[PDB]
Write a protein that binds this ligand. Structure first.
Ligand SMILES: [Mg+2]
Ligand SMILES: [Mg+2]
Ligand SMILES: [Mg+2]
Ligand SMILES: [Mg+2]
Ligand SMILES: [Mg+2]
Ligand SMILES: [Mg+2]
Ligand SMILES: [Mg+2]
Ligand SMILES: [Mg+2]
Ligand SMILES: [Mg+2]
Ligand SMILES: [Mg+2]
Ligand SMILES: [Mg+2]
Ligand SMILES: [Mg+2]
Ligand SMILES: [Mg+2]
Ligand SMILES: [Mg+2]
Ligand SMILES: [Mg+2]
Ligand SMILES: [Mg+2]
Ligand SMILES: [Mg+2]
Ligand SMILES: [Mg+2]
Ligand SMILES: [Mg+2]
Ligand SMILES: [Mg+2]
Ligand SMILES: [Mg+2]
Ligand SMILES: [Mg+2]
Ligand SMILES: [Mg+2]
Ligand SMILES: [Mg+2]
Ligand SMILES: [Mg+2]
Ligand SMILES: [Mg+2]
Ligand SMILES: [Mg+2]
Ligand SMILES: [Mg+2]
Ligand SMILES: [Mg+2]
Ligand SMILES: [Mg+2]
Ligand SMILES: [Mg+2]
Ligand SMILES: [Mg+2]
Ligand SMILES: [Mg+2]
Ligand SMILES: [Mg+2]
Ligand SMILES: [Mg+2]
Ligand SMILES: [Mg+2]
Ligand SMILES: [Mg+2]
Ligand SMILES: [Mg+2]
Ligand SMILES: [Mg+2]
Ligand SMILES: [Mg+2]
Ligand SMILES: [Mg+2]
Ligand SMILES: [Mg+2]
Ligand SMILES: [Mg+2]
Ligand SMILES: [Mg+2]
Ligand SMILES: [Mg+2]
Ligand SMILES: [Mg+2]
Ligand SMILES: [Mg+2]
Ligand SMILES: [Mg+2]
Ligand SMILES: [Mg+2]
Ligand SMILES: [Mg+2]
Ligand SMILES: [Mg+2]
Ligand SMILES: [Mg+2]
Ligand SMILES: [Mg+2]
Ligand SMILES: [Mg+2]
Ligand SMILES: [Mg+2]
Ligand SMILES: [Mg+2]
Ligand SMILES: [Mg+2]
Ligand SMILES: [Mg+2]
Ligand SMILES: [Mg+2]
Ligand SMILES: [Mg+2]
Ligand SMILES: [Mg+2]
Ligand SMILES: [Mg+2]
Ligand SMILES: [Mg+2]
Ligand SMILES: [Mg+2]
Ligand SMILES: [Mg+2]
Ligand SMILES: [Mg+2]
Ligand SMILES: [Mg+2]
Ligand SMILES: [Mg+2]
Ligand SMILES: [Mg+2]
Ligand SMILES: [Mg+2]
Ligand SMILES: [Mg+2]
Ligand SMILES: [Mg+2]
Ligand SMILES: [Mg+2]
Ligand SMILES: [Mg+2]
Ligand SMILES: [Mg+2]
Ligand SMILES: [Mg+2]
Ligand SMILES: [Mg+2]
Ligand SMILES: [Mg+2]
Ligand SMILES: [Mg+2]
Ligand SMILES: [Mg+2]
Ligand SMILES: [Mg+2]
Ligand SMILES: [Mg+2]
Ligand SMILES: [Mg+2]
Ligand SMILES: [Mg+2]
Ligand SMILES: [Mg+2]
Ligand SMILES: [Mg+2]
Ligand SMILES: [Mg+2]
Ligand SMILES: [Mg+2]
Ligand SMILES: [Mg+2]
Ligand SMILES: [Mg+2]
Ligand SMILES: [Mg+2]
Ligand SMILES: [Mg+2]
Ligand SMILES: [Mg+2]
Ligand SMILES: [Mg+2]
Ligand SMILES: [Mg+2]
Ligand SMILES: [Mg+2]
Ligand SMILES: [Mg+2]
Ligand SMILES: [Mg+2]
Ligand SMILES: [Mg+2]
Ligand SMILES: [Mg+2]
Ligand SMILES: [Mg+2]
Ligand SMILES: [Mg+2]
Ligand SMILES: [Mg+2]
Ligand SMILES: [Mg+2]
Ligand SMILES: [Mg+2]
Ligand SMILES: [Mg+2]
Ligand SMILES: [Mg+2]
Ligand SMILES: [Mg+2]
Ligand SMILES: [Mg+2]
Ligand SMILES: [Mg+2]
Ligand SMILES: [Mg+2]
Ligand SMILES: [Mg+2]
Ligand SMILES: [Mg+2]
Ligand SMILES: [Mg+2]
Ligand SMILES: [Mg+2]
Lengths: 50, 143, 23
RNA sequence: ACUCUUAAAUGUUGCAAAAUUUUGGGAUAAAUUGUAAUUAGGGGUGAAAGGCUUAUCAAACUUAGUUAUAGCUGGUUUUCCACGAAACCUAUUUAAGUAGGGUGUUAUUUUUUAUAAUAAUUAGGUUUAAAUAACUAUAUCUAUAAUUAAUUUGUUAAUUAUAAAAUUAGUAUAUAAUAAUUAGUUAUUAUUAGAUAAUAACCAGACUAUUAGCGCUAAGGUUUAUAGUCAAGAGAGAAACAGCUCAGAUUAAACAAUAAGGUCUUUAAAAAUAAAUAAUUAUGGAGAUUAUUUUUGUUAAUACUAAUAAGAUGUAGGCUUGGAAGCAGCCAUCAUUUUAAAAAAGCGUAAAAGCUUAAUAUUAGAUAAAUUAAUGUUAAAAAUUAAUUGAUACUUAAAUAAUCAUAGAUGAAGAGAGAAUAAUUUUUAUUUACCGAAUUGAUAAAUCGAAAGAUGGUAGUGGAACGUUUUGUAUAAAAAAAUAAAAUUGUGAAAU
RNA sequence: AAAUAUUAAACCCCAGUAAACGGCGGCCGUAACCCUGACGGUCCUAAGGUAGCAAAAUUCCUUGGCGGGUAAGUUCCGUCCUGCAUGAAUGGUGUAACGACUGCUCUGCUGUCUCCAAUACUUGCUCUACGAAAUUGAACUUUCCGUGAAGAUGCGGCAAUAUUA
RNA sequence: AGACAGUUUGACUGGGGCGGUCUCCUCCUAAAAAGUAACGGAGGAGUAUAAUAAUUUGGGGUAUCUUAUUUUAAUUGAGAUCAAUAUUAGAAUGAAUAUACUAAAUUUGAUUAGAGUACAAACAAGUAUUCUAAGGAUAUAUGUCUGUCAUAUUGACCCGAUAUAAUUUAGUAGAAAAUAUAUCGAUCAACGAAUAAAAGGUACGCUAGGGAUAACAGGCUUAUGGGUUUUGAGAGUUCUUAUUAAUAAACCCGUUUGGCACCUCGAUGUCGGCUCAUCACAUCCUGAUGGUGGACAAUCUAUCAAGGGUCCGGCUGUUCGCCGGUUAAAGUGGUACGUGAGCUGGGUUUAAAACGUCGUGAGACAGUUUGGUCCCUAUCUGUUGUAAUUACAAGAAAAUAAAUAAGAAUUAAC
């Protein structure tokens, strides 16, 4: 059913024809998934100094 | 974005769907430093949580120092817009709710001048556990 | 509501005859 | 009675194209009803609901214009041989349509303005970048020239500005400068097309790899770019699979070597030599436990382990405090006695008391092992530098391996099933070999072609044929039809 | 050929018409306590919602607030008033009688229900005579999970069934 | 005189509609040739000007900072500095520095005619300009000039019009008229422009098509949602973890609000209730146990655990929810938010009618209110029950075991 999340095996050389799996997993060395429920901070002219 | 008129102008910037950069780290001002070890969106609360604990280290009562301890160079770069709940796609771009800093791989978050080696290792480990990011601590001694 | 769009067409600029060619 | 039909059940291809049964309204009146007749299609009639007008009414029925029109749906009848697309651009009361370009086929011509590969070569301004011109922010230095307060004003103390010099981070719409590849032209080699004419189909695209823009850098999402495959394409491997890999099928037929893949059994095909794991073994998270291996150094023979003991004093330090006695908090971190013992690294108290570590002793057990480089031979009741590896403890820490890290709803459901403790089986590394496609080579035939070799194919173009009806050939010759079965020939429709 | 002068109905201007249609305000401050606002000014309008009724067949916030009835009531009755978006022949208010009209309540009554049982006929089942209907790719027609044009009797994988009525 | 009639009443679009846009210019997107889309991000244009134009001439090079000067500078002098700033008519990019800015003298090249290549390019359209001829300006000219530094600064054809370098045949000659060279007139802005000439309603509705395109449901996603886990601001006498938990973080599930628009548009479906059920466990009670700021009791928290059990009633269309009363407890959810070829049809989505509001009007409403029609004989699967035929061991009449499966009521006052 979920042809999206069918992971490719050996003979399927790193790719299925309708999978969105391998393209997700390349992003966990330069991307992290953020959140809404954080503190609102809106001043781009903020000073990070102590 | 555009740094010319920050407050006046309304600002938008492209999300960068795969942005990766490495910048060769090296100390300039001081002895020891903390450096990041992964491309990441560095929030502000990632700093303000452990802001006091640096003052307790670098600054103390009844002691005067002429030279400077900390050198920070952090500025905001990414507006991070978003849509509402029941809104279809199209019909334009979303609106703002926050601001962030997109940092590269090897980024000098902090540069220190004669600060207690024993505490910063105790700090950066706790820093990295809240954040779950890889961070490092470096000193001219070990190098 | 969007007020944007309205770009123009590209203009066929650049070099048409390169070095060594016949003229 | 008659007339109408409120309410329910039944019935719903029923007894009935609106009824039966029970109940109920009006019942001398704006009543009910028979006979015959009038009013007629955007008009009739209407105590008005868009109702009725022969079961048909937001405009009847019948015939006729009329074979109404349809950029729409549904459909388009026998065979063989060759070649072989598109789902892009530009315009459109246009977006499921159409037109031209682009791609396809055929034909013609003393016909290359062509495709691929290699190499040389030219511009560029993505990218690169301990680069920094700009924007946003920013750390330092200094000649020189000056200041302020105070009677320690022939001193002391604290300070300011500045030429030259000068750091650092960031960015879609930041770059003086500067990559590879792509692209243009030229040459070389190899293929075989190119140009013109006559003319059809397409103009809803899908996925994957790389790359970007909107989006929760969510969606089998949506829109562009560069290749590939489906589309228009079977066979083998992926448990089963339009889009991933291998590969590109003329047809035939009980030969062999191979491609991705796979070799315990199911399942066709192999074993050897070394090692990892012991978990009902695949299959993964922040992070935790255990084990192993490797590593840093201002460390150290009183190493380390165990048993017993000790862990003190000036001192309740000074101050503060309702109290502060080593240990709320502030300043200080001195000194002595000891073989050693912190104005204490901690627990503890209302404050005291009391407990434990660091530092340490007695006794026993017990680790300290291997090396490199120098001034030829003369100092000495005597003394040797620089340096490594390794055993142990403290210390810096990381890595590898296994285990755990909760799970949904018809039934193990993950891992194709079962099993297997590495002995022909999971995993890792060397070695030698095999099975395995419609691939390739070998054999036979057909068609194009001198020959080598070519022949998948949708829309779609072109070529070659079968069968049926009619007429003439026929002023000639004669039963050749139809139905069923079998046989025979043909690449086949079919024929005899 | 063109132009000027002469002029009708109609149109404009003007007047009239509101049981024709239609329409009906706000700001400032003011009284032994804020708030309240008889009043007084203030700006505007053609005029400023008068009488009366009012959570209504009209109320978005709303199961509005209080009371009544019920062991307990979003509905019902009565009542108050920010009437979101009441209002006078699109008629306002009230009203005895009449209603196969709509909403709420009471007594009585009872298989509606707690809780369903027994009985009669019909229908039905068996034999017999007669004999329809829409439908229907073919059919030797199994469960589960997985699979996939995305919810499988039909593919894959472990299995089930002596055969049929 | 809509009294009557014949007709129009745009398109794109992440359903459609409301809203916004529709042509042209510049950058980013754009991935070092050119090109490259999106209801992607931003800004601009529908002009100006007879000198802001053409040829010569002069001046300081501009700009930034400091300083001195018969206190004055057409535009003083000197010195240092400037990855090319200052500017260059207006947006942005690009480029120039013999630029640009400034002063001045002569002047109209912002003229006419004819031939042709190249870029670009479906078409049409648009662009740069050399060469030849006439007739001029400038003034050593030897030469330079066919509007402005550049790119946008607009509109086809038809019809018609003013001035005219040329021709004429509706019998002939003229008039009339047509055409030709130069030239003017449109927010035809839906900007390739279908007409000179154009708005709405349909709950009375019809037909052709579409899952190319929406609402319920399935499927993918899981921002949101719920839950586990790590960290531990702050309460808890002290004290982070008896209890509690902000913030930050790593995964899971697929019950909510939603995004997309893959299946179904060639007879059906919406919530709720009656009857009937089945499954999970992330368990409300019962049962076992650890911990406790646990004396006992009552209670709080966590783990293991699915055997059996889990209320009636009033108001509402109602799940829910409030209320009254109780119980050992009155569980969270999935199954086309289970169950309409098994029942109901009260709500909501047709036709009638009314009030309020909007609207000239037809009429409309994520407002209210009264009323209000879809049907079925079960072929197969599946299932509750009942038999027939046949087989096995020689044939037959009877009695049993074995094996597997199914089933089993919970609670507890006193
Ligand atoms: Mg565009
Ligand atoms: Mg452009
Ligand atoms: Mg009667
Ligand atoms: Mg009566
Ligand atoms: Mg009566
Ligand atoms: Mg009506
Ligand atoms: Mg009738
Ligand atoms: Mg009609
Ligand atoms: Mg005709
Ligand atoms: Mg027509
Ligand atoms: Mg071919
Ligand atoms: Mg294509
Ligand atoms: Mg048009
Ligand atoms: Mg169409
Ligand atoms: Mg064509
Ligand atoms: Mg062609
Ligand atoms: Mg450059
Ligand atoms: Mg540098
Ligand atoms: Mg940098
Ligand atoms: Mg860039
Ligand atoms: Mg089209
Ligand atoms: Mg298209
Ligand atoms: Mg496409
Ligand atoms: Mg498309
Ligand atoms: Mg995607
Ligand atoms: Mg897609
Ligand atoms: Mg799509
Ligand atoms: Mg294939
Ligand atoms: Mg296959
Ligand atoms: Mg291939
Ligand atoms: Mg072959
Ligand atoms: Mg072989
Ligand atoms: Mg075998
Ligand atoms: Mg881990
Ligand atoms: Mg002791
Ligand atoms: Mg003492
Ligand atoms: Mg004291
Ligand atoms: Mg003390
Ligand atoms: Mg203490
Ligand atoms: Mg104390
Ligand atoms: Mg002491
Ligand atoms: Mg072994
Ligand atoms: Mg072995
Ligand atoms: Mg061969
Ligand atoms: Mg072939
Ligand atoms: Mg062929
Ligand atoms: Mg009125
Ligand atoms: Mg009043
Ligand atoms: Mg009420
Ligand atoms: Mg009440
Ligand atoms: Mg009332
Ligand atoms: Mg009114
Ligand atoms: Mg009224
Ligand atoms: Mg009146
Ligand atoms: Mg009326
Ligand atoms: Mg009335
Ligand atoms: Mg009344
Ligand atoms: Mg009355
Ligand atoms: Mg009545
Ligand atoms: Mg009422
Ligand atoms: Mg009973
Ligand atoms: Mg069968
Ligand atoms: Mg299935
Ligand atoms: Mg198969
Ligand atoms: Mg099967
Ligand atoms: Mg009309
Ligand atoms: Mg008219
Ligand atoms: Mg017509
Ligand atoms: Mg449309
Ligand atoms: Mg839409
Ligand atoms: Mg380019
Ligand atoms: Mg890029
Ligand atoms: Mg395109
Ligand atoms: Mg504009
Ligand atoms: Mg100028
Ligand atoms: Mg000059
Ligand atoms: Mg000067
Ligand atoms: Mg200009
Ligand atoms: Mg400019
Ligand atoms: Mg001119
Ligand atoms: Mg060209
Ligand atoms: Mg052209
Ligand atoms: Mg131009
Ligand atoms: Mg010029
Ligand atoms: Mg025209
Ligand atoms: Mg004549
Ligand atoms: Mg004449
Ligand atoms: Mg027009
Ligand atoms: Mg148009
Ligand atoms: Mg157009
Ligand atoms: Mg165009
Ligand atoms: Mg109506
Ligand atoms: Mg229809
Ligand atoms: Mg849905
Ligand atoms: Mg998921
Ligand atoms: Mg979330
Ligand atoms: Mg506390
Ligand atoms: Mg705390
Ligand atoms: Mg679809
Ligand atoms: Mg479906
Ligand atoms: Mg249809
Ligand atoms: Mg059907
Ligand atoms: Mg459990
Ligand atoms: Mg249960
Ligand atoms: Mg039991
Ligand atoms: Mg009652
Ligand atoms: Mg009720
Ligand atoms: Mg209760
Ligand atoms: Mg449904
Ligand atoms: Mg349901
Ligand atoms: Mg059903
Ligand atoms: Mg009105
Ligand atoms: Mg009634
Ligand atoms: Mg049957
Ligand atoms: Mg069946």
């Amino acid at each position: 059913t979920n042809r999206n999340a069918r992971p490719p095996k050996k003979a399927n050389h790193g790719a299925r024809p309708c999978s969105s799996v391998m393209r997700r997993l390349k992003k966990k060395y330069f991307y992290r998934r953020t959140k809404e429920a954080m503190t609102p901070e809106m001043e781009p002219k903020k000073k990070f100094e102590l | 974005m555009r740094f010319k008129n920050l407050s006046n102008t309304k600002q938008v910037s492209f999300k960068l769907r795969n942005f990766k950069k490495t910048t060769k780290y090296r100390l300039v001002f001081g002895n020891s430093m903390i450096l990041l070890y992964k491309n990441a969106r560095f929030e502000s609360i990632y700093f303000e949580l452990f802001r006091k604990y640096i003052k307790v280290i670098s600054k103390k009562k009844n002691i005067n120092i002429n030279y400077r301890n900390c050198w920070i160079f952090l500025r905001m770069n990414t507006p991070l817009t978003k849509k509402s709940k029941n809104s279809r796609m199209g019909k334009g771009k979303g609106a703002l709710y926050r601001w962030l800093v997109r940092l590269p791989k090897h980024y000098k978050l902090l540069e220190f001048k004669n600060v207690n080696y024993y505490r910063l290792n105790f700090l950066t480990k706790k820093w990295s556990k809240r954040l779950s990011l890889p961070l490092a601590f470096v000193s001219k001694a070990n190098l | 509501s969007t007020q944007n769009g309205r770009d123009s067409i590209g203009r066929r600029l650049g070099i048409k005859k390169f070095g060594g060619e016949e003229v």
